[PDB]
Amino acid sequence: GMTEYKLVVVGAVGVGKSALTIQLIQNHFVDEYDPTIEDSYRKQVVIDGETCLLDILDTAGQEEYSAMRDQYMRTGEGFLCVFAINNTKSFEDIHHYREQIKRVKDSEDVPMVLVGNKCDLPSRTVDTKQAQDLARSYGIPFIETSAKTRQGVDDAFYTLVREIRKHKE
Ligand SMILES: Nc1nc2c(ncn2[C@@H]2O[C@H](COP(=O)(O)OP(=O)(O)O)[C@@H](O)[C@H]2O)c(=O)[nH]1
């Protein structure tokens, strides 16, 4: 039979984790989705000829107990590490997410895709080079997205599944 993959969407508050996830799941852009809600969604997709089931956790940051964060990192098979291209702090936070996920999984090889979201907005502060360089330093893909226009959205999630498949192989 087919396989279910656990994908985890991480990043600073307001970078567009929820907007990206809802676009993938429901095919519309949600302007106002409570920043404090953490939920998961299932979606069956075909990627490279193989059907699979995505179980996507849209994270919202601190948990009641940090042990709960550690648990979703341990069970998570691939991570979408999202920053917003107009928020340098959210980009610098990626260093922390990369470290923390590796630390919790006690692994040097964790499937991830770096996502620079809000690419439809003006006055970018994080340039493509910075982000491309960081992703290269991690050995992972970098994709620029807009949850509003859908630029790169499917690409980001499907690329993450490909990265999970490569890790498991
Ligand atoms: N213009 C634009 N706004 C976005 C995009 N992604 C998210 N937003 C907005 O940015 C804010 C934060 O989005 P949200 O999905 O709630 O971020 P989260 O806290 O990471 O889940 C919201 O007001 C969204 O409308 C995007 O790609 N483009």
Ligand SMILES: [Mg+2]
């Ligand atoms: Mg959210």
